[PDB]
Amino acid sequence: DLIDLLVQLWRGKMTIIISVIVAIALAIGYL
Amino acid sequence: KKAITLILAVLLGGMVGAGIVLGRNALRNYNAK
C-alpha cells in the first residue's frame, strides 16, 4: 500500500503519544 | 565472527539507505500533485 495514509499518523502526533503513555500507565500498574 | 557481521552490515546499511532515498522522493511526489 502507498504512503497516502502514513501522513495522518504524523498529522495525529500527540494522539499517538497519549495512547502509548496510557498503555505504560496500565503496564507498570500491572507490575 | 568478523566476516558475517560486516556482510550483514553493508546489506543492512543499504536497505535502510534505500528507504531514505525512496522516502525523500515519494513524499516529494505525494506532496502538491
What does the angle CA B5 – CA B8 – CA B10 come to, to the nearest 5 degrees? 105
Closest chain B residue to A6, measured at CA:
B27
Distance, CA of A11 to CA of A26 (rounded, Å):
26
Segments of chain B assigned E as strands: none
Query: What is the identity of the amino acid at B24?
Result: R
Residue in A1, A2, A10, A13 with CA at minimum distance from that of residue B30: A2
Asked if residue B27 lies in contact with residue A3, where contact means CB atoms within 8 angstroms, the answer is yes
Residues 6+ apart with CB under 8 A from B27: A3
Distance, CA of A21 to CA of A27 (rounded, Å):
10
To which residue does cell 522522493 refer?
A: B25
Query: What is the identity of the amino acid at A22?
Result: V
- Tell me the three cell numbers of residue B9: 552490515
| Gap from A2 CA to chain B (nearest CA, Å) | 9
Q: What is the resolution of this structure in A?
A: 3.0
Query: What is the identity of the amino acid at A15?
Result: T
Is A24 in CB contact (< 8 Å) with chain B?
Answer: no
